[PDB]
Amino acid sequence: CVQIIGGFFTWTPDGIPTLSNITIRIPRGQLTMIVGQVGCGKSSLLLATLGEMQKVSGAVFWGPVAYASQKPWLLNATVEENITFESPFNKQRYKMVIEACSLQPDIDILPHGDQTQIGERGINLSGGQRQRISVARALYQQTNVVFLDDPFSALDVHLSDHLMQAGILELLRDDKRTVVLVTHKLQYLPHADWIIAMKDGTIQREGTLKDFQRSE
Ligand SMILES: Nc1ncnc2c1ncn2[C@@H]1O[C@H](COP(=O)(O)OP(=O)(O)OP(O)(O)=S)[C@@H](O)[C@H]1O
């Protein structure tokens, strides 16, 4: 599991802290949503769980962890390359990830059916395509933990439903990975195990769905 006790850090060598008194357990094989308002330390907590931000006074334990950031990024290479990301290619695995991301038709829409040279930052692609490619990169890698920083911001309702069904609840939940996804929707609340509510950089309440509905 991913254990955190006494969260405390900020974005400076000295200054007022934004991370304050966070204690969270992320057990294996469990969907964990993080919900809250705009500016409640969701992605900050994501990067702190990563070890990206060495906290001032606190303990954090859990490694190579797959992670798709909020702002999508690409390489100066092909689509297959960005989705493989220096990994030995697979037939069934890669085709599964391609189909489960609702990406094969739009991939075939491009001027080059595949191995198309993705431009610098993705000028000849749209935001939703970049996001789907990032989510495919995150899902395709073989690892224990996956983070997805709101992968449903530039997607429709149909594509988001198909992604959360085929790629998340059927493919991620298949191999029993520790999926930690942060977003704000309705369909995903009853599909997770632990609900995490954040307010002003503090965990307001914590627990499961029933422990959240039986509390204030
Ligand atoms: N890379 C960074 N460097 C310095 N400051 C940052 C950085 N990222 C975020 N911040 C600051 O940290 C504060 C909180 O940022 P976030 O944690 O990303 O907000 P959030 O609502 O919890 O998650 P979002 O909005 O979905 S990314 C913001 O006010 C930023 O000014």
Side-chain angles (χ1 to χ4, degrees), residues 1-13 15-199 201-204 206-210 212-215:
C1 48
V2 182
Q3 169 189 340
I4 290 188
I5 157 182
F8 194 89
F9 193 51
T10 185
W11 304 80
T12 13
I16 50 180
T18 174
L19 219 177
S20 175
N21 314 331
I22 282 191
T23 292
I24 158 193
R25 291 180 179 178
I26 314 174
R28 178 189 296 181
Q30 157 219 42
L31 240 187
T32 299
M33 307 306 176
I34 304 184
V35 79
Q37 308 302 299
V38 184
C40 291
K42 303 180 302 178
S43 305
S44 305
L45 185 57
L46 206 69
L47 298 189
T49 52
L50 219 45
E52 180 60 45
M53 292 206 309
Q54 184 93 40
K55 299 179 187 181
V56 175
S57 64
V60 41
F61 329 92
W62 66 73
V65 28
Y67 162 84
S69 173
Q70 187 190 18
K71 196 169 66 64
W73 93 290
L74 316 171
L75 283 86
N76 210 30
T78 64
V79 182
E80 314 167 346
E81 199 163 344
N82 289 270
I83 301 175
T84 44
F85 204 88
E86 284 83 17
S87 170
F89 222 107
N90 262 84
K91 171 183 180 178
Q92 286 292 342
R93 165 90 174 189
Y94 166 86
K95 290 173 60 57
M96 274 288 307
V97 178
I98 284 288
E99 299 164 5
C101 290
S102 311
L103 198 50
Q104 192 183 24
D106 183 83
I107 275 307
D108 300 336
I109 294 181
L110 266 49
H112 295 251
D114 221 337
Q115 306 228 347
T116 319
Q117 190 63 38
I118 297 181
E120 289 72 17
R121 303 180 301 102
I123 300 181
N124 35 336
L125 293 85
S126 67
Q129 303 170 4
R130 300 169 57 184
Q131 289 193 4
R132 291 199 300 264
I133 292 180
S134 60
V135 178
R137 175 193 297 109
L139 170 59
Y140 176 83
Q141 284 292 352
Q142 310 279 14
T143 183
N144 305 339
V145 193
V146 290
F147 300 117
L148 288 81
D149 222 324
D150 190 13
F152 317 101
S153 49
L155 283 77
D156 306 79
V157 188
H158 324 273
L159 299 189
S160 299
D161 295 5
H162 182 272
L163 171 60
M164 198 269 311
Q165 182 69 16
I168 300 182
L169 285 185
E170 283 183 2
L171 202 50
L172 286 164
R173 190 177 178 176
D174 180 68
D175 299 314
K176 285 305 178 181
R177 296 163 158 268
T178 301
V179 180
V180 182
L181 205 159
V182 185
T183 181
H184 40 278
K185 287 294 182 57
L186 56 154
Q187 4 150 9
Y188 315 146
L189 308 170
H191 281 137
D193 300 359
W194 266 46
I195 299 179
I196 305 181
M198 304 294 301
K199 271 192 177 181
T202 52
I203 309 184
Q204 193 177 20
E206 192 54 52
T208 58
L209 174 64
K210 306 172 184 179
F212 165 79
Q213 207 59 32
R214 293 179 306 174
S215 63

